[PDB]
């Protein structure tokens, strides 16, 4: 697993070392947010992260470089960049230079990562370079090669064989949408090339849910291979309960009128969703992620409230990080959610909720 630092990503739509997974969604919705959350989370690991800032503002690039530097994660991150004021030539080139750097570091038997931002600007640059050369225009003026252009650079991020040192480049590109359209030419092309998709809907971004990941569309095709043994179980419990939450979403204000079972269903789903919210550039490690998802999906917040549960869960995470350091031992040495680990977590939960109900 390529651990992301977000509960939704690593829990539901799992990204592994080698799988391509783009972030589709409207403008100013959280694509650069989760794209930096991922890279800033990689400090606990050893990977070499690559950012390809294409066609940007040259000021957001300096801002996010200052972010990566003042957070310490520039100790490994290379950020190639070619802003909008550049010709179409260098914007078209830059992702290939990022891919060559990641290819080299991957061929040194070392796991890597690369972020493309965005492929839409790269495609616009290539389309301009084509139309200036009187190459025949195609659908929405994009020439007949943007598919080959994108597939060419996206097929280079591989988990190589164990005779070549199992190096891994995890291409995690970004393709913005206009008016919520993924059926345009460039979005359809990229979502057909890449393995999984992650839909960031700006409606959820205006609905408090940040990161605004839309689980009903976002899906990865790697599956359980990108989740550790301690993860996939609670991920299954969470997908079960969250599908049972979304299918009961219409029965909103009728929860008192509902059945008692469906009333617990709606309330527990709401606790799960309020757990899903987490601030920008706040990474969560695999101990923290499994602690959060466990305490959420097993009804240990159903006595609590939809407002308190964020403060309550961060305080429970602090309590179990400080008072019970053995959970980190068990998770990072055994990679499984054993019986003793589960009971240790429940006793941490019980004492924290007993101390917190007094507060």
């Amino acid at each position: 697993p390529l651990q992301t630092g977000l509960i939704a990503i690593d829990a539901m739509i799992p990204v592994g070392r080698g799988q391509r997974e783009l972030i589709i969604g409207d403008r100013q919705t959280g694509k650069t947010a989760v794209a930096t959350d991922t890279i800033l989370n990689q400090q606990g690991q050893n990977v070499i992260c690559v950012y390809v800032a294409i066609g940007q503002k040259a000021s957001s690039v300096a801002q996010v470089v200052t972010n990566f530097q003042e957070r310490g994660a520039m100790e490994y991150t290379i950020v190639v960049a070619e802003t909008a004021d550049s010709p179409a030539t260098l914007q078209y080139l830059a992702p290939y230079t990022g891919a060559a750097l990641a290819e080299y570091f991957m061929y040194r038997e070392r796991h890597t990562l690369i972020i493309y931002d965005d492929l839409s600007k790269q495609a616009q640059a290539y389309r301009q370079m084509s139309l200036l050369l009187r190459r025949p225009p195609g659908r929405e003026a994009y020439p007949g090669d943007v598919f080959y252009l994108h597939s060419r650079l996206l097929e280079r991020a591989a988990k190589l064989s164990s005779l070549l040192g199992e190096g891994s480049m995890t291409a995690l590109p970004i393709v913005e949408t206009q008016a919520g359209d993924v059926s345009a030419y460039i979005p359809t092309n990229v979502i057909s090339i890449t393995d999984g998709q992650i839909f960031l809907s700006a409606d959820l971004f205006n609905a408090g849910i940040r990161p605004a990941i839309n689980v009903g569309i976002s899906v990865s095709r790697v599956g359980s291979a990108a989740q550790i043994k301690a993860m996939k179980k609670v991920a299954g419990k969470l997908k079960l309960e969250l599908a049972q939450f979304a299918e009961l979403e219409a029965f909103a204000q009728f929860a008192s009128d509902l059945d008692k079972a469906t009333q617990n269903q709606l309330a527990r789903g709401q606790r799960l969703r309020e757990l899903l919210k987490q601030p920008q550039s706040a990474p969560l490690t695999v101990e923290e992620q499994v602690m959060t998802i466990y305490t959420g999906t097993n009804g240990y917040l159903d006595s609590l409230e939809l407002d308190q549960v964020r403060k309550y869960l961060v305080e429970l995470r602090t309590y179990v990080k400080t008072n019970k350091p053995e959970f980190q031992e068990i998770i990072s040495s055994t990679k499984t959610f054993t019986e003793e680990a589960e009971a240790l977590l429940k006793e941490a939960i019980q004492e924290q909720m007993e101390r917190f109900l007094l507060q």
Binding site: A250, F254, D257
Partner: protein, 271 residues
């Protein structure tokens, strides 16, 4: 902007579709609850009317002259139009108002000079805005229909009738004979026979088609009401009840009970 507004109109007609399914399911849940609430008042009125019959046999000879069952000089007929406090239900409110205007048009040529009672918000607002009809009292749905709303309408018609102010008080409420056709039947309430069997507005004793205890079932993918005629019956009589407390006063004690139970079952069946 055409494709975006078209996608958004698609989304609107999807959200309305799914919330209409939602209101369908919560309405079927409350229907299934209401037919249980009928059974919650079934044994009371069952043994109650059985008492009203069996105790009446030795008091068939003597005359009690109960004021609830007296005959005032038949001049006026009051009318309780039992509308729900809700809208968007369908023809329920409008068919009630059709039978209501038909009754207060039918009672104008006989020389009756009727009055009205209103116990639904979507009906009592209509009777608020129409001053031509003599309204005595408006009822809304705030107090509990289980005891409190039933008792409010009960003691209100009791006050209108036991001091004998208005002449008659009759009831205009519908039943659960079907899903595709509700029929607002016009049954009189306050001029009652001492047996335990209601009379029509003209006294027909229309309880021959009683057919009570509606419970919802399905013959196919859709649900029909399946009115499912009378199941159980357990009266015998009292051999020598040798009872105290002045049998006139006993029947005047037994009448308001049965009246409140009739009004409670009326409100449950309307809802």
């Amino acid at each position: 902007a055409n494709l975006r507004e078209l996608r958004d109109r698609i989304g609107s007609v999807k959200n309305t579709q799914k919330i209409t399914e939602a209101m369908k399911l919560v309405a079927a849940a409350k229907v299934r609850r209401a037919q249980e609430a009928v059974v919650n008042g079934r044994p009371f009125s069952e043994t109650l009317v059985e008492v009203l019959y069996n105790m009446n046999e030795q008091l068939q000879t003597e005359d009690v002259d109960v004021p609830l069952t007296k005959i005032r000089t038949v001049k006026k007929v009051a009318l309780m139009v039992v509308t729900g406090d809700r809208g968007l239900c369908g023809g329920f409110n409008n068919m009630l108002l059709k039978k209501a205007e038909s009754r207060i048009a039918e009672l104008k040529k006989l020389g009756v000079d009727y009055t009205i009672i209103s116990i639904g918000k979507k009906g009592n607002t209509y009777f608020i805005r129409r001053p031509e009809i003599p309204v005595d009292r408006y009822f809304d749905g705030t107090n509990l229909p289980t005891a409190k709303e039933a008792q409010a309408i009960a003691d209100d018609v009791f006050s209108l009738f036991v001091s004998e102010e208005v002449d008659k008080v009759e009831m205009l409420y519908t039943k659960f004979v079907s899903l595709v056709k509700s029929d607002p039947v016009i049954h009189t309430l306050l001029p009652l026979s001492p047996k335990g069997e209601i009379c029509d507005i003209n006294g027909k004793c229309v309880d021959a088609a009683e057919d009570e205890l509606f419970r919802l079932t399905t013959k196919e993918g859709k649900l029909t009401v399946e009115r499912d005629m009378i199941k159980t019956e357990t009266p015998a009589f009292s051999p020598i009840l040798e009872f105290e407390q002045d049998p006139a006063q006993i029947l005047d004690a037994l009448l308001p009970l049965y009246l409140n139970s009739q009004i409670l079952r009326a409100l449950q069946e309307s809802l």
